[PDB]
Design a protein around this ligand. Sequence first.
Ligand SMILES: [Ca+2]
Ligand SMILES: [Ca+2]
Ligand SMILES: [Mg+2]
Ligand SMILES: [Mg+2]
Ligand SMILES: [Mg+2]
Length: 350
Amino acid sequence: GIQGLLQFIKEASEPIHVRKYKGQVVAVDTYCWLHKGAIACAEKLAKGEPTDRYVGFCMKFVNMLLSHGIKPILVFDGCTLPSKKEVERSRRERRQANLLKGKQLLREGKVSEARECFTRSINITHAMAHKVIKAARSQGVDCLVAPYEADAQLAYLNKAGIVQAIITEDSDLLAFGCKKVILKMDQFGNGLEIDQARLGMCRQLGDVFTEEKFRYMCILSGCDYLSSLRGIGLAKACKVLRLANNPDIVKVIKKIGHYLKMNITVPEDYINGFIRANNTFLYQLVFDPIKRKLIPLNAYEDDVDPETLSYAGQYVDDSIALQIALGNKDINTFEQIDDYNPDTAENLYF
DNA sequence: CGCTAGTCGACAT
DNA sequence: ACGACTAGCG
Ligand SMILES: [Ca+2]
Ligand SMILES: [Ca+2]
Ligand SMILES: [Mg+2]
Ligand SMILES: [Mg+2]
Ligand SMILES: [Mg+2]
């Protein structure tokens, strides 16, 4: 999630209702709904007590989309991305920190802060995700567990034409090149749509409305695959690109100290880190539901060697990928928690 | 004055 | 895997 990205391109956003896509198909970043629903039962989840509320909290949104005549596809986060290892590690450590801070120092001190610390230590497991999957499937709703980050999977489904819109609360989806992104959607179906084509309607952006340039902006503003330089947020990220007359991004990143009149000594780790982040946004491994194959988000260009993109996701066998995608194989422990098969028992597969 | 990083409440009841 | 509010810096 990029800080201040909403306001920056506010002019490319319009308030809609889900009924706009009646008869059409939307894909959902379900982990957001899960994180939002687990809040109402953070205590039981922190203390390891059995709870089943988040499932209902997802199924009500599902029932709403279904009621307004939408075909939803629920996409789930899968294996942890190596390029995102640092950020995810940070989230892990913060989760453990809040978990301890509540569980021990608030069970005997003050109980009012206990729920607050518990809510800051919520960790969406694949088990819970599988509860939601079981429910949705029982109500006839297709599901898909991304090989890695659901961002890339959703972006793929939109760019491939399988879905026309994507429901999420994560603004990262734009940097991935999604056509339409529905944000901040409430219980009844009122949210903020963001069309990619409308990005040109933003004063502050300038000529940074193209996919590549917008991607660059998002990356060097600060993301989950690479932290920004100190003192550089969205505005200066945009200004650098606006003032850049040179097509090559590397030379620009090198002369970033000259463009902004700031004292910036750019390291090489930030250069190669930038290349890594770009390659992550471009070719992160997703799952093709039709062909049942693990593919890069975009087809590999001429200036990229696939053997060096280990951080963008590891290739596994197509059968293993298919089993992960069906939610049969647990992400954390790699065991067959289920044996669901789509061929037996107009779906995504076949 | 524009802008960035960092804190703390809402997130959903 | 959030965002309003703002103190402080260039
Ligand atoms: Ca409408
Ligand atoms: Ca895997
Ligand atoms: Mg993010
Ligand atoms: Mg995500
Ligand atoms: Mg993201």
